[PDB]
Amino acid sequence: KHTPINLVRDLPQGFSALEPLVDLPIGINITRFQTLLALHRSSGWTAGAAAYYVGYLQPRTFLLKYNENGTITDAVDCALDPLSETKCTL
Amino acid sequence: FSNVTWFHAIHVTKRFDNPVLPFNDGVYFASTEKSNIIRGWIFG
Amino acid sequence: KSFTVEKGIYQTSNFRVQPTESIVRFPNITNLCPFGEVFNATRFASVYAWNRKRISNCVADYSVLYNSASFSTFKCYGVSPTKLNDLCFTNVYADSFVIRGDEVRQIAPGQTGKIADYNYKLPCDFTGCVIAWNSNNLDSKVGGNYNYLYRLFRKSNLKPFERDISTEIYQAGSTPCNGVEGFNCYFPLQSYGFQPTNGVGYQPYRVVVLSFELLHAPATVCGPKKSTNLVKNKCVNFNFNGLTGTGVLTESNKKFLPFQQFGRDIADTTDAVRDPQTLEILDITPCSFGGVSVITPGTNTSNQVAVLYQDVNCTEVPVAIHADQLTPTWRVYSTGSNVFQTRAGCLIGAEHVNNSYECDIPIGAGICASYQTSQSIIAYTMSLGAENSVAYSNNSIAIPTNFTISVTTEILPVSMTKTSVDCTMYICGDSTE
Amino acid sequence: LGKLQDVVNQNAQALNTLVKQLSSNFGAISSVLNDILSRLDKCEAEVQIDRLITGRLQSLQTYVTQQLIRAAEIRASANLAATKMSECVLGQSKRVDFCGKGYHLMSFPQSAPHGVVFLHVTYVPAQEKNFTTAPAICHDGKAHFPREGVFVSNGTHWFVTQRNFYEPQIITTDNTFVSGNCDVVIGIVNNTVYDP
Amino acid sequence: GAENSVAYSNNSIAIPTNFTISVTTEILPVSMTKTSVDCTMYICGDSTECSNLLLQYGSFCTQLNRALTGIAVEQDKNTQEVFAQVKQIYKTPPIKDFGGFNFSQILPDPSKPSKRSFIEDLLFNKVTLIKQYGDCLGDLICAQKFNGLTVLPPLLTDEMIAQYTSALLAGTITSGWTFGAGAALQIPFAMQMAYRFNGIGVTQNVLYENQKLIANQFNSAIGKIQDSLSSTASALGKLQDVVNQNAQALNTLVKQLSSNFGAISSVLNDILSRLDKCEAEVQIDRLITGRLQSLQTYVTQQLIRAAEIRASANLAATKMSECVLGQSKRVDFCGKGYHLMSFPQSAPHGVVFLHVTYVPAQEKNFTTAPAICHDGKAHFPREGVFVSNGTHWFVTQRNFYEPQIITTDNTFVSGNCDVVIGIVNNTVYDP
Amino acid sequence: LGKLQDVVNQNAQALNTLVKQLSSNFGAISSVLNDILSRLDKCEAEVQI
Ligand SMILES: *[C@@H]1O[C@H](CO)[C@@H](O[C@@H]2O[C@H](CO)[C@@H](O)[C@H](O)[C@H]2NC(C)=O)[C@H](O)[C@H]1NC(C)=O
Ligand SMILES: *[C@@H]1O[C@H](CO)[C@@H](O[C@@H]2O[C@H](CO)[C@@H](O)[C@H](O)[C@H]2NC(C)=O)[C@H](O)[C@H]1NC(C)=O
Ligand SMILES: *[C@@H]1O[C@H](CO)[C@@H](O[C@@H]2O[C@H](CO)[C@@H](O)[C@H](O)[C@H]2NC(C)=O)[C@H](O)[C@H]1NC(C)=O
Ligand SMILES: *[C@@H]1O[C@H](CO)[C@@H](O[C@@H]2O[C@H](CO)[C@@H](O)[C@H](O)[C@H]2NC(C)=O)[C@H](O)[C@H]1NC(C)=O
Ligand SMILES: *[C@@H]1O[C@H](CO)[C@@H](O[C@@H]2O[C@H](CO)[C@@H](O)[C@H](O)[C@H]2NC(C)=O)[C@H](O)[C@H]1NC(C)=O
Ligand SMILES: *[C@@H]1O[C@H](CO)[C@@H](O[C@@H]2O[C@H](CO)[C@@H](O)[C@H](O)[C@H]2NC(C)=O)[C@H](O)[C@H]1NC(C)=O
Ligand SMILES: *[C@@H]1O[C@H](CO)[C@@H](O)[C@H](O)[C@H]1NC(C)=O
Ligand SMILES: *[C@@H]1O[C@H](CO)[C@@H](O)[C@H](O)[C@H]1NC(C)=O
Ligand SMILES: *[C@@H]1O[C@H](CO)[C@@H](O)[C@H](O)[C@H]1NC(C)=O
Ligand SMILES: *[C@@H]1O[C@H](CO)[C@@H](O)[C@H](O)[C@H]1NC(C)=O
Ligand SMILES: *[C@@H]1O[C@H](CO)[C@@H](O)[C@H](O)[C@H]1NC(C)=O
Ligand SMILES: *[C@@H]1O[C@H](CO)[C@@H](O)[C@H](O)[C@H]1NC(C)=O
Ligand SMILES: *[C@@H]1O[C@H](CO)[C@@H](O)[C@H](O)[C@H]1NC(C)=O
Ligand SMILES: *[C@@H]1O[C@H](CO)[C@@H](O)[C@H](O)[C@H]1NC(C)=O
Ligand SMILES: *[C@@H]1O[C@H](CO)[C@@H](O)[C@H](O)[C@H]1NC(C)=O
Ligand SMILES: *[C@@H]1O[C@H](CO)[C@@H](O)[C@H](O)[C@H]1NC(C)=O
Ligand SMILES: *[C@@H]1O[C@H](CO)[C@@H](O)[C@H](O)[C@H]1NC(C)=O
Ligand SMILES: *[C@@H]1O[C@H](CO)[C@@H](O)[C@H](O)[C@H]1NC(C)=O
Ligand SMILES: *[C@@H]1O[C@H](CO)[C@@H](O)[C@H](O)[C@H]1NC(C)=O
């Protein structure tokens, strides 16, 4: 998912639903990974201001709200806190 | 409301960091970026 | 489930409408599929490096592909072979390789062994199938082919659909031998020996596995069936990219995302579809719909009846009964002189009467019906009772000068039959096993 | 006797459906155990007989649940019948329409198959006549009200009479009682009050 | 609750000097939605090859449809037994000379096209819940109807139920309890009220002495009811729970069509397009068993709820008989207090009773005694109790302080004045 | 106090039957999930579970 933003420090204060694109049949064991940075050059290099966030997925049960137009607008993480647990059960 | 490890590269030291990370049955990768620096990934 | 129905009103199901024609509507793809490249390939890949071919934009031809190649094992999971033509597949992948003879059984869900642990693993939730056929006349030469290899050793079994082309030395012993050959650490790959005159279990077998998933994503591969023109506002045996059902179709204005092709309601059935040839969003409804109540005086009194169609608007009931296809003995009850639009729906076969009586047969929404003698059925608003008015006044009383001693019979059940059941005798007809 | 016959019919019909449900296959090759046990060996006879056993036990449970529902209904009706036997046969009920349309005099029970029949005998006033009335009587500045009955007039005189039978009586001091002056009450009229 | 303590004493009584005419609203469900289900449409989405497989069961669905038909007939029963107590439509009189009492809020409004009253109009708005076909072709109800679930309409419409209610009100206010016991006589309203009062142990004089005040209290109480159910909507909880349960069980029933029950899918078209005869049969058997089982679960729950509603409806019929058609001596059956009368009002799938009752209000302590020794003989009262204001002795009826001088007609004599305990000395006037 | 004791007994006995019904196989190879999930792979563990 790609979105506009005008915040500089930390995550957005909101919620966005990710769409699929790709589903490549590579058949590869993956345990480690890495990111590919760039160099502005003119050791003779400089790096522009960029920030990347990494978060490990976990096996969880979620609840999803599909609006009338068919896009996810809200969700609940069951087992986050008791309130979300009750929203999950009910 | 999890905790995600923040990494960033800033001119300012110069803070060049992009180490190898574990890939434990999934990764969520978000980039707040302006000038096309966070561009690709390795997996293995 | 009897003959002598009693006086009353009875709900019934709808045996009325039956389909008469079939509709097939598949996309406009006529490219014959690249199956020669995967079946008629000069060299298949070694099993440890099995070759996955993408297949797309195909009119995927008939079931077994029984053209020249006689296929030994053709066993299909999730799809019956017979229906294999009728469908349109979303994401087809052809996994081709060659193995020895006796190991062909290992290519299936839940199997295990050399092939299904170190070389090529399948899932349980696998929809697709496995064409296996002998190719000793090609994939074996004198002296044995030293081109087809299999992974002899791995420190753990594979996950489904995972490839492993590594060549690190497998440390059978506890002492590492720094990646070279030696004692208790062996080369993980072993080459097959396929002599042209060796046993059936050692003859090279060509295997391909067509893996796909059905009726959840935009189809690109289509079966050999030729399309027709859909018959709208009338219920058919439609076929939209594989699904087989029955129901009237209608236009719609839902905003489908590009990667989505189906739309499901709360009941998990299809309520929105995209036509393959024409890019547009539609919706589906059934045609055997609507309740039907039948009003009868008790047979032994007549055979006339009336018919109530629930919640219909009988300026357009014949399109709801589908009165373009049914015996006339029902179509007389679809339209006639005796039509009456009650708030409960429309009533056919009984005349509306402006009187009001205490009623025999309830209909609904304040309407009842009866069989009166002018020998026919009548439908009317009931009479709540005799109209009356008490002459109230601030100084007038009414006092009785006489009385009656009435006797009223009223009946209450108290008990019912004390039944008893032996499970053993009922379930198991005195058989010990 | 509709209600009793409905009870009998429901009880005799649930059993008939119960036997008729032995003809269902429940996904098995047949619905007769002898067929399965003659045509099949141990293994697949077991796996089909499990289907049949599950289906038949399920239908048995359905029957028993329906019987529990009907038994609760019948227990409610029986508790009502016991209450009616207590309050109308063993006594006279002041409850309205509990034991007949009218003022209850008495009741008789009669047995019946799987139930009881009550002959409720009741008083129903029959022939009504209009009269002019008033709530009170001003004799000599004090207001008179009746103890039993109501003040009534045949056009000329005034009487007290009990309601559900016209039996006028002349106004006397024992027929009535006195409470306060004859100004507060609304609708009072003028008449003498005989003194025995 | 509030802590309290009654100052019990062997010679102290507390008697009311004033009262209140309270009106209490209490709500009973009577009917619920007459649902109906076509097995074939629900289990087998109008596919003939699934219908043939289902056909070997057969008796299961006859059983289910029979049960639901019984439920629907039972609901129309319940409405009949509650509202159709009297088969004479007494129209309300045109002139409202009821001795200060104002029934305009409960009686029908002729201006409105419907025969509902003001209160009935309010009651039909605090409950939320007819979808003609062509609306679905162009929602929960549409899915229900597409999956064989229909909601049959009640036999009696709301106008007709309101007409029954209006007849009951007219009979109650023009005739009293007489129209329940056969022929409807007539009685001026203030007299009927006098005698509803006599029924609770206060003499008819007290009403006529406080007729205007009592009518004012009744009118004010009716207004407070109007405000109290015009402001909040949780008052009609029971009816809304009935509606919600009935509309929610159906929603679970349709939502249970998404279960696989161990099959490859939950859509018959998928199974019938991807599979040949053999394994389509064996999977469709699983689906048929699961869906029929869920249908049976729904029907069983409906039978339970129908039994509950029948109990409530029998209670409502008993209340209509014993409190609208008469005055009940049963305690707390028809309101907290001594029952004077009751009014019915219709409501969606139920009934509302305005029970108007007598509540003694302002109590005063008095010294009392069980008896009076005049000249060696003991005197006991007929109606009321011996009471003292400190100096004199009077007889007074309980639920209103109206002392009377001790006379021979006020009392009676039985035996010498030694046996009784607590007797006191006083003269007994002789008229 | 028969009626109260019958209430208590029925309520405490239905629960006991409920736990005792965990021993039924319902046509499966066993009645303990650990047995099925240790002796069987994904496919047939699913179909028995
Ligand atoms: C995917 O790769 C990782 C490491 O590259 C494998 O995990 C190791 O497996 C060996 C034995 O096979 C163990 O000795 C190591 O302790 C494991 N290390 C870790 C971090 O797990 C893993 O087995 C591979 N996945 C598969 C299915 O084979
Ligand atoms: C009260 O009603 C009864 C009938 O319910 C009347 O009895 C009838 O009286 C007439 C003449 O007196 C006779 O010809 C009939 O044979 C009687 N019928 C029966 C069944 O007894 C009675 O007359 C009425 N009494 C009053 C005062 O009105
Ligand atoms: C009933 O009788 C009393 C007295 O006999 C009537 O009171 C008189 O009413 C007239 C007016 O109509 C006054 O002029 C007198 O002063 C009243 N006298 C007394 C002693 O009160 C009373 O009006 C009569 N009631 C009716 C309806 O005629
Ligand atoms: C009995 O209670 C009523 C109120 O419930 C009293 O009525 C009030 O009386 C006072 C003065 O008499 C008036 O200021 C009020 O306006 C009245 N309120 C209402 C609603 O009417 C009545 O006074 C009391 N009577 C006795 C004997 O105590
Ligand atoms: C009975 O109560 C109503 C109040 O609800 C009294 O006032 C009438 O109320 C309705 C609706 O608010 C209005 O349409 C009428 O115009 C009101 N009438 C008058 C005269 O103001 C009503 O008056 C009371 N009935 C009597 C006989 O007084
Ligand atoms: C009520 O009156 C009677 C007689 O007037 C009282 O009886 C007398 O009681 C006294 C003792 O207190 C005796 O000495 C007398 O002999 C009694 N005389 C008679 C005729 O009985 C009686 O005591 C009085 N009760 C109270 C509570 O004072
Ligand atoms: C849904 O789509 C319509 C048309 O694009 C639009 O008018 C409406 O604002 C959308 N509503 C939501 C909640 O996205
Ligand atoms: C990260 O977040 C979790 C919960 O928000 C917290 O327990 C943890 O302490 C945080 N990590 C550090 C280093 O504080
Ligand atoms: C496929 O191709 C043409 C052009 O897109 C289109 O008009 C046509 O309706 C499609 N279907 C068939 C059967 O040609
Ligand atoms: C495959 O090759 C053989 C000849 O070697 C030929 O007869 C056959 O038609 C070919 N089949 C396909 C699908 O190309
Ligand atoms: C029904 O028909 C039979 C014979 O035809 C007759 O004996 C019986 O009286 C009839 N019952 C009614 C209610 O018409
Ligand atoms: C549909 O029903 C309404 C009243 O229920 C009626 O006014 C209308 O004419 C009907 N539609 C048509 C096309 O007649
Ligand atoms: C019945 O009543 C309607 C409405 O008044 C009227 O149009 C119609 O002519 C009447 N029909 C008969 C047979 O009286
Ligand atoms: C009482 O008066 C009204 C009209 O004045 C009349 O219709 C009614 O019949 C009278 N009651 C009797 C029993 O005659
Ligand atoms: C009313 O009753 C009295 C009692 O004697 C009688 O004299 C008088 O004639 C009666 N008048 C009428 C109209 O009945
Ligand atoms: C009764 O009503 C009439 C007119 O409606 C009136 O003339 C008369 O004064 C009233 N009498 C009483 C006691 O209210
Ligand atoms: C009656 O007596 C007790 C104590 O003597 C007192 O608390 C109570 O308030 C009195 N009752 C009234 C209405 O005052
Ligand atoms: C008690 O009632 C009598 C009746 O006349 C009266 O004389 C006396 O003053 C009253 N005493 C008190 C304390 O109220
Ligand atoms: C009532 O009780 C008091 C003290 O508790 C006692 O003095 C008095 O004699 C008793 N009176 C009666 C009639 O019991």
Numbering used by the authors:
A (entry chain C): 206 to 247, 256 to 303
B (entry chain C): 59 to 70, 76 to 107
C (entry chain A): 304 to 676, 689 to 748
D (entry chain A): 945 to 1140
E (entry chain C): 700 to 828, 834 to 842, 848 to 1140
F (entry chain B): 945 to 993
Reproduce, without paraphrasing, sentences from the article in which this PDB structure was first reported:
The spike (S) protein of coronaviruses is responsible for interaction with cellular receptors and fusion with the target cell membrane. The spike (S) protein of SARS-CoV-2 has been observed in three distinct pre-fusion conformations: locked, closed and open.
We observed that the S-R/x3 spike can also be stored at 4°C for 40 days retaining well-formed trimers in negative stain EM. This suggests that both the locked-1 and locked-2 conformations are metastable at pH 7.4, and spontaneously transition into the closed conformation.
